[PDB]
Amino acid sequence: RKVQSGNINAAKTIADIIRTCLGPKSMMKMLLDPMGGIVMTNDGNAILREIQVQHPAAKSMIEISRTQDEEVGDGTTSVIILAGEMLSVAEHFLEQQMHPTVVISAYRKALDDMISTLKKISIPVDISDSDMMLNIINSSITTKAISRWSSLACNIALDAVKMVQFEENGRKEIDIKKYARVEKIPGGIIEDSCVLRGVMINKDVTHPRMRRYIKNPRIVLLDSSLEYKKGESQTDIEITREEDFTRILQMEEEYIQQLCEDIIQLKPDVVITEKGISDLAQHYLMRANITAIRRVRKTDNNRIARACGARIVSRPEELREDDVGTGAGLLEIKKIGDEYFTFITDCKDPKACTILLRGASKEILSEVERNLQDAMQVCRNVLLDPQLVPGGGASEMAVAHALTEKSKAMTGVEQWPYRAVAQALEVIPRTLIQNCGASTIRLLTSLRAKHTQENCETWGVNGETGTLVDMKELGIWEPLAVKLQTYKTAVETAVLLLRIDDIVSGH
Amino acid sequence: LYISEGLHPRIITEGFEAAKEKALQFLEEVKVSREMDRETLIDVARTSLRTKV
Amino acid sequence: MLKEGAKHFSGLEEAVYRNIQACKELAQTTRTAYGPNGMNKMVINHLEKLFVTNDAATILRELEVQHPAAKMIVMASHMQEQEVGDGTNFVLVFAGALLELAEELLRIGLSVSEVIEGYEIACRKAHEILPNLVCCSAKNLRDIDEVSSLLRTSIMSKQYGNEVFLAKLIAQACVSIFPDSGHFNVDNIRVCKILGSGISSSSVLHGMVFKKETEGDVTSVKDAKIAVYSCPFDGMITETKGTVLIKTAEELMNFSKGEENLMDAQVKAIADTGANVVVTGGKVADMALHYANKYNIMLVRLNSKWDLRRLCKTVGATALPRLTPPVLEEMGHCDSVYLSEVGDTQVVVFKHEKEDGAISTIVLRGSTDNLMDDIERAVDDGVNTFKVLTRDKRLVPGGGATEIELAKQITSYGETCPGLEQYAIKKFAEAFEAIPRALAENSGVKANEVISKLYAVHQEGNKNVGLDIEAEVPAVKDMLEAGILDTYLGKYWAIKLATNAAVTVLRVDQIIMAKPA
Ligand SMILES: Nc1ncnc2c1ncn2[C@@H]1O[C@H](COP(=O)(O)OP(=O)(O)O)[C@@H](O)[C@H]1O
């Protein structure tokens, strides 16, 4: 029994790195470069990403933390600390007789009891009014950021969140990552950011000749199968001589005539094209009562695949009679600013609005981007479950007390690991007290003696002074799903690290 | 020296911020105006040249 | 550096390290015993005989330690040995458990004053709650089986094979003198060793018993006053050699006649002064035994320092190893001296009991001299356990059934008073779980399941783990009807001495320097 010890040693070594980086009064780490550089930062994720280890358990924990940060976005630091504490309090004390069997059942029972206690303590909330949501967002975002234009940004983010939801059918699916981006354009007053349809068009449309103005037509986008290819599936035609180049014009004319005879009744406009631009064929194409655009990047592809819904397949002609393009859509090339902008309004797949902000340099861009990101993340974490829990260090004490009471009432045989895993939940209050700068023994004793009278479970420790205060007068609340996900991830990591036998090599 | 004696950096930072605020208030209250002319600029340039060359 | 001269490793860091590891290593070489088990250890010192012992008293009396932390416990051990009969390993185990449980509290970050106060409070609570688990009591001490059961229970801790005959013999020897009521002495019972048959042929006899032969006559009179001497038959006339072969017969005959006349005058003066018998402690001679047979004077043969020391400390005489015939100044109180034939050996019997201060001497016999030591140890332990100086012993169900109850009571009491005094109370309560663990680990099975079973049945306080195979895993037995009880005052004194030793150890803990020459 030496592999588990070597695994928990590396686990505790990894966990004892970013332990003093929690709370408003956190420390700052510094990393030196081998060439002669030094960078100081207080971000645990940056230190975890810039680290290089060699143990498989450390890499697995890093991957788990990265997955937890990418899936949720809040609560990717205390998981490793809790896992290391549970390991050091369980395996480093209850493995002298070598019995790795009842520990898994004890962990499962403790997880079930913690889930039941956290579910039987939540309070309901209403989502009718908007002032309470804004107040909750402002209270949860007051961490380490500027305070000057946070109200307007949070209001715009809440409006975008309430407007981007449309995929409801019983499962409540919310997607804002690949469904709402950010646009930037300098010039003008900074007090005009709002929401708009948002079309990724800058300098892609090129009209050498002056034609008619676009008012409110019916644009029906097709596919991208008109480049430097050899045809459909045979090599009968190849772009090699000028005769083939001038026959390509007649071929495209015949193709557009076949398309018009097939399924052209709303008169589309521009079409997606990757290759194909000249000074003679483009004139004939424009004269053929059709237009074509080029210069398409990944952003335009994502926009036409999300908002419009354009797919990629080997089928340019003969499509569905009612595929895309259903509704009156205006496309006026406005001259506001200095670049060409399109405002495709009222078309297919609505509720896909983006933001419109006019700042200045790149600092304003970065700050509004991070503000929108954190506000949208907070709104998504809050709207996912209308249940709040008083954080700060009040629910963990009640959970530990309930677990101890259940263990004393059941009077079982495996009560020692249960008590060990129940008493290993007071790490966050101890760390907060240590970061505040006070006694970690007398304060803990007072908090333990206070959480046992009658109806007292909202008394936590202030993160700025170092005294016990009720949560009903401060205003520190956390969502419910985040704590459950954190506990489940910690339990799964402990189970995975506890079920490791021998390690060998292979192919 | 105060850390080796036994204290916390948070109290030291708070005291330093309070002292900085007090010094800023004292400098704002102790300032005085003066009519800009030719002798003042001459003396300023002379002091600058003496401190440089 | 400034005080020590590179001799000791003391300073501001050995408080929770060097001062606990020594006691832990000292107590680690003792948990192997404690209980009816066969864990004999050989002792080699200066006798050069290679003998195996089982009790920790002889083990600690031969080991030489060079540490003050280890020497601070042998004093309490000797005090407990001088106070009551048994009780030695309990104090050491309690001190070791207390130190091992206080090491964690010291490593966490707590002062020693709070721990000392909590330990004192827990000890006071235990002493207050102790007089509450009294079950059986002593009825009449004039019976036989009533004390025989207790003697058997006390002997079962040492010898496991034979324990009924020895207990019955000790009970018969103790009931033939005086009971616990009134006055009862301890140094009035002697143990003699006879090299003959086995231990299945022992007996009892009241009075003095000594293995001394007699080459004279049976003197059964009351005027035969004793007269102890050092070496009266040594050599009052030193003879040298003149030539190489032989000297003149005239001078040798004259010297022999002179020596014979001198010894005849000496024995005549020692017999006419009021002393019919004489205690000699030297060699013998042909003319000596001839005169002893023709003068009706009892002559001994076997001599031993212990015999004369006992005769001097009992009667009150003084040996006079002089050449000139002295005066009679060794008058004692003995008068009835008889001879008996036991095991084809001549033994003496002294009769001088006036219904006050009676003495007794049990007859012991074994194979070799390396087997009677354990028998004598068991006998003296049972004798010391029989003495309690009280009519009602107030026996409690020992063996570990009361330790769990005391620990549970201390745990229930500690969960009431708030403050920083609960950790020491919890540690003192958990330290009581060191007796069943050592008894279960020295048998053949584990100790966690035994503790769980003892804590899962009920809080009756009369359940303990047995010794057979059918009582190791379940460990559900009632020791009240079997006859396994312990001393009430002994456990109290042991707990008090253990608490005092722990307090003394936790107090003196700083820097150990030296002394100038
Ligand atoms: N004003 C406050 N009062 C009490 N506790 C606070 C206060 N502000 C922050 N905290 C605590 O500080 C902790 C900060 O955690 P955080 O570092 O954001 O976790 P993560 O790094 O996983 O996002 C929170 O758990 C919260 O309970």
Ligand SMILES: Nc1ncnc2c1ncn2[C@@H]1O[C@H](COP(=O)(O)OP(=O)(O)O)[C@@H](O)[C@H]1O
């Ligand atoms: N036959 C037995 N049954 C149950 N318990 C026993 C038996 N013999 C001894 N013990 C227990 O072993 C412990 C140690 O006994 P003993 O060796 O006489 O004292 P010490 O260990 O102080 O020398 C006692 O507390 C007693 O309860």
